[PDB]
Amino acid sequence: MIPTEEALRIVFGVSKRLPPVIVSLYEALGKVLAEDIRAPDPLPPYPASVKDGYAVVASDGPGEYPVITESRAGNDGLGVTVTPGTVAYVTTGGPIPDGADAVVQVEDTKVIGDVSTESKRVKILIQTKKGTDIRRVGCDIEKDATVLTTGERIGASEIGLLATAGVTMVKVYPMPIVAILSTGDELVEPTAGTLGRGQIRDSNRAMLVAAVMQQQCKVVDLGIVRDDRKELEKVLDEAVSSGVDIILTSGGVSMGDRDFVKPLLEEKGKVYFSKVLMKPGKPLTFAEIRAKPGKTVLAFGLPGNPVSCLVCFNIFVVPTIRQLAGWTSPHPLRVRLRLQEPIKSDPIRPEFHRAIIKWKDNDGSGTPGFVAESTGHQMSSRLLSMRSANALLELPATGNVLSAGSSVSAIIVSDISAFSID
Amino acid sequence: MIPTEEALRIVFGVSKRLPPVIVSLYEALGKVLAEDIRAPDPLPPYPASVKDGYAVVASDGPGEYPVITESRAGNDGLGVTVTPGTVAYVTTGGPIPDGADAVVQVEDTKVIGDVSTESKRVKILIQTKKGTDIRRVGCDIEKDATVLTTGERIGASEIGLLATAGVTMVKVYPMPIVAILSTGDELVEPTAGTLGRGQIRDSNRAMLVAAVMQQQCKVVDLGIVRDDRKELEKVLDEAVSSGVDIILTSGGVSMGDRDFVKPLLEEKGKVYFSKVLMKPGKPLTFAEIRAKPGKTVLAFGLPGNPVSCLVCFNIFVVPTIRQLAGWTSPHPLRVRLRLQEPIKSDPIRPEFHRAIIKWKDNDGSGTPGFVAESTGHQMSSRLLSMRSANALLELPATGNVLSAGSSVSAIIVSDISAFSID
Ligand SMILES: Nc1ncnc2c1ncn2[C@@H]1O[C@H](COP(=O)(O)O)[C@@H](O)[C@H]1O
Ligand SMILES: Nc1ncnc2c1ncn2[C@@H]1O[C@H](COP(=O)(O)O)[C@@H](O)[C@H]1O
Ligand code: MOO
Ligand code: MOO
Ligand SMILES: [Mg+2]
Ligand SMILES: [Mg+2]
């Protein structure tokens, strides 16, 4: 039995970043960059107007002037020089014609004379300064500037920067492919209606398929496997040979006489641990299998108890997926929060207590902060204790009652940007 | 020009939850439940062992006893009664045979005699209590108990609860379908290499496609549209008739003489506003179009400036997607944080200043909390100001320099569970 911090250190030490691949721009979203990106041209590549109005010679000052060209895009005004005593109409993003050194926004101007006559004239109502409302070449992005670097995760703004730079095929770290199976003679498919004696619906498999889909990985669903050593070996050898990077099993890892996951993983590879000092998730097995040519497969013999299964996925499998996906910060967000109710900590095993947390203007102490409500009874067989739980409170093994208003460390396990407000 | 709080109130008031649909279990992930879910049978549906060991009569106490059956799943031990003076082998999740009222874990037992002889005997090493290590029928979930309710978002634990309850087809609120187009004679596709005079790559479209994909919505990519009124009307009528729920355009909404988005939206529907008091995102247009039979289409005439485009998406479009998707808490997470450097606020427009935020053990004041670093120059044409930005600091329009260490409100715009730790 090892502490969770040691089990996390071992998993991290064995887990290796996947070889990079080339993907399309839309396939690059969510992925970590495996190359630096440089701008091939400046942004803007031409002097551009910040406003809809008139490009002027600043030194001319307020007065009435003829409009000698109109510049909105492309070759508009090419070969036209705005000389002292003239102006050019411009729209935002329009190229500044040669000779103009400032832009006066349309609100500080007035058109003079009849619009029907070909010759347009405008009254500039202010005294402007050279450079006003013009984006010089390269002011937003300089040519050859690094706009994105290796190790940076691609979100919407990063896709926008790749498009700005003309990069539609991107070198990234891929997501791992994950195989998932359930174990047990007592299991039936979740499509089962009336259950026969001693049967339960397989809930862990669909739960883990959903959890892995939330981490943006491809899933290989290997179904229900019975408590038969040859059958489980065949399905594990099949998963190892299929090209997946991670295998997730649940159940068949406790002290039962037909719990074959641990001895099969010892036979096929290297088991680093099979027991962890934690509440819930004690029978967790982690192993490294080498697939014959030629790559490493990580195997997590997750516990059968639904709560223990999901907590072990959240604490150990999520950072492993991220490490394989090239994240430099794979660890989960940890915050500090105040308890909204008293919670009794366990006397021997530190607890990952499920909570529903929210940000409050007053956390109970006068200042703003996160607050936590327990999900109730914490039994490892009670999947209702994971319902709506967006955090795991880290309760040390003291045996004391932590009173309402006391502060604890909490691992956030679900999208902080999808947190329901107070 | 209206304040952002009024623009958000108007958008919320017009936006209506989409009609619910029936989807498969894996399609239900991320979606909000449109029906309550009740357990059709209890969990466990039979008295189940919490441990691998022996089912006993508690009153028998420590002693040596014959093992009369073995119970791991299904019909194991059916018709066998554990009477006083006998025990039954059980594995975790195994049905408790009739007559046994407690379980003694295998660690508190010892097998006696030769294993080869058919008759097995075990020594129970402790005095147990009635009910120990047995999960009674329905202790985790009672039959007909409500396990999930209308308005609850489906995450991995909720998929696990649907599978437990045998629900593989779920009534949910769907995500809206979003049409996206760019406007401008100066735009070229992001596949363009060398740019001609007065051209830029279309970056907003791929950025908004990525942003909408992160919100789990289907995208209808309508491409680049030129600054031609008939062309833009045709593409808008096409989007309205196609069945999308939201149209996103960018550009063609400022004061230019070929900015046709506003007048086209006024003609096709009801424009609620076209100008907002905010830095960045001032030219935002919001309109409601009625598609002929027969449904409502929401249209956001987003600003062309890349920063303004993404900030307006993050503040106004993200809660609208969530409201249409049936979220009861569509608003973004707002927290309070301390500035890591000084920031000058604008004297007239309140600013959505881009920041990279992280949780620190000491936020600078001695206690733990969020801290923010600015992304630098905040110009609306500078997409590099959105790079890695996971929050928008809400700076009031005071004109004062907010010093390092002062606290501000911040909107979190990207997965809090994907936050890089300190
Ligand atoms: N799709 C786009 N990608 C990048 N920049 C754009 C896009 N559309 C408009 N812009 C720029 O945003 C600014 C305002 O656009 P508009 O509202 O059309 O005048 C101008 O500088 C445009 O060149
Ligand atoms: N796929 C599953 N879905 C729900 N419960 C399970 C699953 N697999 C195992 N269990 C339960 O978890 C507990 C421990 O399983 P095991 O480690 O196989 O003894 C037992 O009560 C099992 O019935
Ligand atoms: O042995 Mo556990 O910690 O109830 O899965
Ligand atoms: O007019 Mo803006 O607020 O630079 O898009
Ligand atoms: Mg089992
Ligand atoms: Mg334009």
PDB file of N, CA and C in Angstrom, chain A residues 1-11 272-279 281-282 284 315-316 334 348-350 352 397:
ATOM      1  N   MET A   1       0.827  -1.200   0.000  1.00  0.00           N
ATOM      2  CA  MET A   1       0.000   0.000   0.000  1.00  0.00           C
ATOM      3  C   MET A   1       0.873   1.268   0.000  1.00  0.00           C
ATOM      4  N   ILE A   2       0.807   2.067  -1.078  1.00  0.00           N
ATOM      5  CA  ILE A   2       1.604   3.301  -1.213  1.00  0.00           C
ATOM      6  C   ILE A   2       0.715   4.555  -1.155  1.00  0.00           C
ATOM      7  N   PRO A   3       1.232   5.719  -0.708  1.00  0.00           N
ATOM      8  CA  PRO A   3       0.399   6.940  -0.732  1.00  0.00           C
ATOM      9  C   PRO A   3       0.097   7.405  -2.162  1.00  0.00           C
ATOM     10  N   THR A   4      -0.988   8.183  -2.353  1.00  0.00           N
ATOM     11  CA  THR A   4      -1.392   8.664  -3.684  1.00  0.00           C
ATOM     12  C   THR A   4      -0.289   9.488  -4.362  1.00  0.00           C
ATOM     13  N   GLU A   5       0.431  10.320  -3.584  1.00  0.00           N
ATOM     14  CA  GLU A   5       1.499  11.159  -4.137  1.00  0.00           C
ATOM     15  C   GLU A   5       2.589  10.288  -4.758  1.00  0.00           C
ATOM     16  N   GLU A   6       2.926   9.137  -4.121  1.00  0.00           N
ATOM     17  CA  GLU A   6       3.908   8.214  -4.693  1.00  0.00           C
ATOM     18  C   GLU A   6       3.350   7.538  -5.948  1.00  0.00           C
ATOM     19  N   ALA A   7       2.078   7.094  -5.913  1.00  0.00           N
ATOM     20  CA  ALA A   7       1.432   6.454  -7.074  1.00  0.00           C
ATOM     21  C   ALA A   7       1.377   7.416  -8.273  1.00  0.00           C
ATOM     22  N   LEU A   8       1.085   8.712  -8.022  1.00  0.00           N
ATOM     23  CA  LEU A   8       1.084   9.746  -9.071  1.00  0.00           C
ATOM     24  C   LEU A   8       2.517   9.958  -9.627  1.00  0.00           C
ATOM     25  N   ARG A   9       3.525   9.980  -8.750  1.00  0.00           N
ATOM     26  CA  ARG A   9       4.932  10.146  -9.168  1.00  0.00           C
ATOM     27  C   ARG A   9       5.382   8.981 -10.073  1.00  0.00           C
ATOM     28  N   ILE A  10       4.993   7.746  -9.730  1.00  0.00           N
ATOM     29  CA  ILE A  10       5.337   6.548 -10.513  1.00  0.00           C
ATOM     30  C   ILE A  10       4.677   6.604 -11.902  1.00  0.00           C
ATOM     31  N   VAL A  11       3.379   6.931 -11.934  1.00  0.00           N
ATOM     32  CA  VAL A  11       2.625   6.985 -13.188  1.00  0.00           C
ATOM     33  C   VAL A  11       3.247   8.052 -14.076  1.00  0.00           C
ATOM     34  N   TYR A 272       3.622  -1.732 -11.284  1.00  0.00           N
ATOM     35  CA  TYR A 272       4.352  -0.838 -10.381  1.00  0.00           C
ATOM     36  C   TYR A 272       3.689  -0.770  -9.002  1.00  0.00           C
ATOM     37  N   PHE A 273       2.368  -1.014  -8.929  1.00  0.00           N
ATOM     38  CA  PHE A 273       1.643  -1.028  -7.657  1.00  0.00           C
ATOM     39  C   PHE A 273       0.276  -1.613  -7.883  1.00  0.00           C
ATOM     40  N   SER A 274      -0.334  -2.135  -6.814  1.00  0.00           N
ATOM     41  CA  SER A 274      -1.680  -2.734  -6.843  1.00  0.00           C
ATOM     42  C   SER A 274      -2.580  -2.267  -5.672  1.00  0.00           C
ATOM     43  N   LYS A 275      -2.077  -1.417  -4.772  1.00  0.00           N
ATOM     44  CA  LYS A 275      -2.812  -0.951  -3.593  1.00  0.00           C
ATOM     45  C   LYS A 275      -2.374   0.485  -3.268  1.00  0.00           C
ATOM     46  N   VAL A 276      -3.343   1.376  -2.983  1.00  0.00           N
ATOM     47  CA  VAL A 276      -3.056   2.784  -2.681  1.00  0.00           C
ATOM     48  C   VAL A 276      -3.760   3.201  -1.391  1.00  0.00           C
ATOM     49  N   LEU A 277      -3.071   3.989  -0.553  1.00  0.00           N
ATOM     50  CA  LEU A 277      -3.647   4.480   0.704  1.00  0.00           C
ATOM     51  C   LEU A 277      -4.578   5.664   0.342  1.00  0.00           C
ATOM     52  N   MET A 278      -5.868   5.394   0.160  1.00  0.00           N
ATOM     53  CA  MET A 278      -6.820   6.442  -0.241  1.00  0.00           C
ATOM     54  C   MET A 278      -8.243   5.995   0.019  1.00  0.00           C
ATOM     55  N   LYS A 279      -9.139   6.941   0.261  1.00  0.00           N
ATOM     56  CA  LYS A 279     -10.559   6.655   0.416  1.00  0.00           C
ATOM     57  C   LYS A 279     -11.246   7.574  -0.625  1.00  0.00           C
ATOM     58  N   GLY A 281     -10.871   4.110  -3.619  1.00  0.00           N
ATOM     59  CA  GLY A 281      -9.940   3.711  -4.682  1.00  0.00           C
ATOM     60  C   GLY A 281      -8.761   2.853  -4.270  1.00  0.00           C
ATOM     61  N   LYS A 282      -8.878   2.092  -3.155  1.00  0.00           N
ATOM     62  CA  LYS A 282      -7.784   1.279  -2.603  1.00  0.00           C
ATOM     63  C   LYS A 282      -7.218   0.172  -3.535  1.00  0.00           C
ATOM     64  N   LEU A 284      -6.438  -0.056  -6.710  1.00  0.00           N
ATOM     65  CA  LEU A 284      -5.906   0.377  -8.020  1.00  0.00           C
ATOM     66  C   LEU A 284      -4.589  -0.310  -8.435  1.00  0.00           C
ATOM     67  N   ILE A 315      -8.198  11.205 -10.799  1.00  0.00           N
ATOM     68  CA  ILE A 315      -6.909  11.508 -10.160  1.00  0.00           C
ATOM     69  C   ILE A 315      -5.716  10.960 -10.923  1.00  0.00           C
ATOM     70  N   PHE A 316      -5.806   9.738 -11.462  1.00  0.00           N
ATOM     71  CA  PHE A 316      -4.644   9.079 -12.074  1.00  0.00           C
ATOM     72  C   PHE A 316      -4.657   8.996 -13.581  1.00  0.00           C
ATOM     73  N   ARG A 334      -6.022  22.724  -8.315  1.00  0.00           N
ATOM     74  CA  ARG A 334      -6.263  22.620  -6.894  1.00  0.00           C
ATOM     75  C   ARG A 334      -6.521  24.040  -6.423  1.00  0.00           C
ATOM     76  N   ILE A 348      -7.681   6.635   9.089  1.00  0.00           N
ATOM     77  CA  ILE A 348      -6.489   5.997   8.486  1.00  0.00           C
ATOM     78  C   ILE A 348      -6.206   6.404   7.021  1.00  0.00           C
ATOM     79  N   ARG A 349      -7.219   6.398   6.155  1.00  0.00           N
ATOM     80  CA  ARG A 349      -7.061   6.695   4.732  1.00  0.00           C
ATOM     81  C   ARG A 349      -7.425   8.150   4.418  1.00  0.00           C
ATOM     82  N   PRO A 350      -6.568   8.950   3.742  1.00  0.00           N
ATOM     83  CA  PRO A 350      -7.007  10.307   3.357  1.00  0.00           C
ATOM     84  C   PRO A 350      -8.153  10.206   2.337  1.00  0.00           C
ATOM     85  N   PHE A 352     -10.938  11.534  -0.671  1.00  0.00           N
ATOM     86  CA  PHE A 352     -11.273  12.366  -1.818  1.00  0.00           C
ATOM     87  C   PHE A 352     -12.791  12.485  -1.744  1.00  0.00           C
ATOM     88  N   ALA A 397      -6.012  12.156   6.740  1.00  0.00           N
ATOM     89  CA  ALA A 397      -6.454  11.080   7.630  1.00  0.00           C
ATOM     90  C   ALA A 397      -6.192  11.420   9.111  1.00  0.00           C
TER      91      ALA A 397
END
